[PDB]
Structure 1
Amino acid sequence: STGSATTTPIDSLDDAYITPVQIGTPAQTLNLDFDTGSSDLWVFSSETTASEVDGQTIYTPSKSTTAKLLSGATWSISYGDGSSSSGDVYTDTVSVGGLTVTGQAVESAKKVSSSFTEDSTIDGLLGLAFSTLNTVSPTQQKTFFDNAKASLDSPVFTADLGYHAPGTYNFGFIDTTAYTGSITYTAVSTKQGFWEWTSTGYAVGSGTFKSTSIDGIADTGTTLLYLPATVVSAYWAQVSGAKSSSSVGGYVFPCSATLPSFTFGVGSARIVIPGDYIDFGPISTGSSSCFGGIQSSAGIGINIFGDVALKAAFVVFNGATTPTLGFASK
C-alpha cells in the first residue's frame, strides 16, 4: 500500500505544517502536525478541558464506532519548546492520504499547554520518530508509520515541505519526479529515538565549504535550524546589523537585509537553503527587527535540522531494518 497527503503551512512564515488525517468511523478529519521529532499521535478531543480549546477541531471518540478505550493507558509529553499535553488513549482507525491503519493508538488530550490552545490551526500531532519515544504508559504504543510499515510497498516515508506553499508527505514510495539529481543516503543513529544523522559541513553564501561533522536530528516538528554557536555566528556575521539578542531570544537582523544562503552537507552532496528561507519576519508586529531562521543549539543539547533546512530538500525517512535518511535537492 501507499499514501500521499498534502501538507500546508499554517501561516505566512511556515511556522508549522498541517496535514489532514482521518480518524474513526465515520471519519473525523483533523489537521495534524507531522513531527519526525516525536512519537505520539495526540489530538484535541471532546475530553479536552473546555477552556483549553479555542478553535481547534476535536476528535469525539464516542461518535466513532471503531474507537475503543485502551484501558488504563495514559500519556504525557513535554516538547523542546516548553509546551506539553496529556490525556487518555483510544485505539481507532487512522488514515493518511489513502493509507489506513486499524488499531492505531490515538492519544486524546485532557490537558494541553497554552501554546497549543493559542494555535487554532493545529488539531494535534502525528509523531514519526521511533516508537521507543512514545509516552503511553504502562504499555508503550507504536507510531502510525511503525504500524503501517509492513503493509507499505517500501518501508519509507518522504517529506517534501514547501517554502510559502503546500508540500507532500508520501508513505510507501519515492516519487522520483519530486526532486532533482540523486538522493544521497546517510547513516542514522536511533539510540536517542530520533532520525539522528551527521552532516558533513556547511557553507555561508558563496563562501568556501567547511568540512566538519555536525550531528543532529531531522525534525519536521521544529520550525528553525539549530546549529552550533560557531556555525551560527559565521552565518550572521555575513548580515550587516545582525546580532544575538538575549531579550528576544536569538539572532535578529534588520528587515531590510538580503540574507545569504546556507549550505549543509549530506555526504559529498550539498543542500542549499536560499536566504529567503531564513527570514522569519518582524519580532513583533510593525518592528523593523526580524527574527533569524538559523539559531544556536547551545542551550538545547542537540542540533536540529528543522523545517528551515528540510524544506530545501526532498527527504527520505527510510525505515528499513537499519534506518537511513536520504536528501535530494528539488
Structure 2
Amino acid sequence: STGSATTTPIDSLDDAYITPVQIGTPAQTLNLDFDTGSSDLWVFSSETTASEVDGQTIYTPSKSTTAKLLSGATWSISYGDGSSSSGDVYTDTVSVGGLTVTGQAVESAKKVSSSFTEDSTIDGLLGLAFSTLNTVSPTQQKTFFDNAKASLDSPVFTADLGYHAPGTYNFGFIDTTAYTGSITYTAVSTKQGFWEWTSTGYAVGSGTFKSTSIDGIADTGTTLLYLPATVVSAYWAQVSGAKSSSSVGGYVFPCSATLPSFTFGVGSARIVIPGDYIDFGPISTGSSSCFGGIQSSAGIGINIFGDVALKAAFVVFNGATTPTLGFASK
C-alpha cells in the first residue's frame, strides 16, 4: 500500500505545516502537525479541558464506531520548546492520504499547554520518530508509520515541505518526479529515538565549504535550523547589523538586509538553503528588526535540522531494518 497527503503551512512564515488525517468511523478529519522529532499521535478532543480549546477541531471518540478505550493507558509529553500535553488513549482507524491503519493509538488530550490552545490551526501532532520515544504508559504504543510499515510497498516515508507553499508527505514510495539529481543517503543512529545523522559540513553564501561533522536530527516539527554557536556566528557575521539578542531570544537582523544562502553537506552532496528561507520576519508587528531562521543549539543539547533546512530538500525517511536518511535537491 501507499499514501500521499498534502501538507500546508499554517501561516505566512511557514511556522509549521498541517496535514489532514482521517480518524474514526465515520471519518473525523483533523489537521495534524507531522513531527519526525516525536512519537505520539495526539489530538484535541471532546475530553480536552474546555478553556484550553480555542478554534481547534476535536476528535470525539464516542461518535466513532471503531473507537475503543485503551484501558488504563495515559500519556504525557513535554516538547523542546516548553510546550506540553497529556491525557488518555483510544485505539481507532487512522488514514493519511489513502493509507489506513487499524488499531492506531490515538492519544486524546485532557490538558494542553497555552501554546497549543493559542494555535487554532493545529488540531494535534502525528509523531514520526522511533516508537521508543512514545510516552504511553504502562504499555508503549507504536507510531502510525511503525504500524503501517509492513503493509507499505517500501518501508519509507518522504517529506517534501514547501517554501511559502504546500508540499507533500508520501508513505511507501519515492516519487522520482519530486526531486532533481540523485538522492544521497546517510547513516542514522536511533539510539536517542530520533532520525539522527551527521552532516559533513557547511558553507555561508558563496563562501568555501567547511568540512566538519555536525550531528543532528531531521525534525519536521521544529521550525528553525539550530546549529553549533560557531557555525551560527559565521553565518550571521555575513549580515550587516545582525546580532544575538538575549531579550528577543536569538539572532536578529535588519529587515532591510539581503540574507546569504546556507549550504549543508550530506555526504559528498550539498543542499542549499536560499537566503529568503532564513527570514522569519519582524520580531513584533511593525518592527524593522527581523528574526533569523538559523539559531544556536547551545542551550538545547542537540542540533536540529528543522523546517528551514528540510524544506530546501526532498527527504527520505528510510525505515528499513537499518534506517537511513536520504536528501535530494528539488
TM-score normalised by L of structure 1: 1.00
Matched with 1:31 is 31
Partner of 2:273: 273
Distance (Å, rounded) in 2 between the aligned partners of 1:257 and 1:317? 35
2:235 aligns to what SS in structure 1? helix
User: Residue 250 of structure 1: CA displacement?
Assistant: 0.1
Q: How many residues align?
A: 330
RMSD: 0.1
1:227 is displaced (CA, Å) by: 0.0
Deviation, structure 1 residue 247: 0.2
Q: Offset at 1:22?
A: 0.1
Structure 2, unaligned runs of 5 or more = none
- The 1-side partners of 2:40 and 2:65 are apart by 22
Which residue does 1:75 correspond to in 2?
75
Report matched runs for 1:25-104 at 5 Å.
25-104=25-104
Question: Cα deviations across residues 15-45 of structure 1 (Å, max 9, x unaligned)?
Answer: 0000000000000000000000000000000
**Separation (CA, whole Å) in 1 of partners of 2:312 and 2:34:** 17
- Cα deviation for residue 127 of structure 1 reads 0.0
Q: Tell me the SS of whatever aligns to 1:234.
A: helix
For the residue of structure 2 that corresponds to 1:48, the secondary structure is: coil
Q: CA–CA distance in 1 between the matches of 2:6 and 2:254?
A: 34
Secondary structure of 2:73's counterpart equals strand
**Residue matched to 1:285:** 285
- Measure, in 2, the Cα distance between the counterparts of 1:205 and 1:267: 19
Aligned equivalents of 1:98, 1:194: Cα separation in 2: 26
Give 1:156 deviation, angstroms. Answer: 0.0
Q: What's the offset of the Cα at 1:14?
A: 0.0
Give CA-to-partner distance per residue, 1:247-295, whole Å, 9 cap, x none.
0000000000000000000000000000000000000000000000000
Displacement, 1:210? 0.1
Distance 1:288 1:64 in 2: 50
- Output the CA distance in 1 between the equivalents of 2:250 and 2:294: 9
Task: Report the secondary structure of 2:178's partner residue.
Answer: coil
CA distance in 1, matches of 2:51, 2:254: 38
Runs of 4+ in structure 1 deviating by more than 4 angstroms, as ranges, are none
1:68-126 residue CA offsets vs partner (Å, 9 max, x unmatched): 00000000000000000000000000000000000000000000000000000000000
Give how far 1:192 is off.
0.0
SS at match of 1:308: helix
Distance 1:287 1:50 in 2: 35
How far off its partner does 1:242 sit?
0.1
Q: Deviations over 1:216-235 (max 9, x none)?
A: 00000000000000000000
* Structure 1 SS opposite 2:70: strand
The alignment partner of 2:150 has SS state of helix
The separation in 2 between residues aligned to 1:33 and 1:225, in whole angstroms, is 18
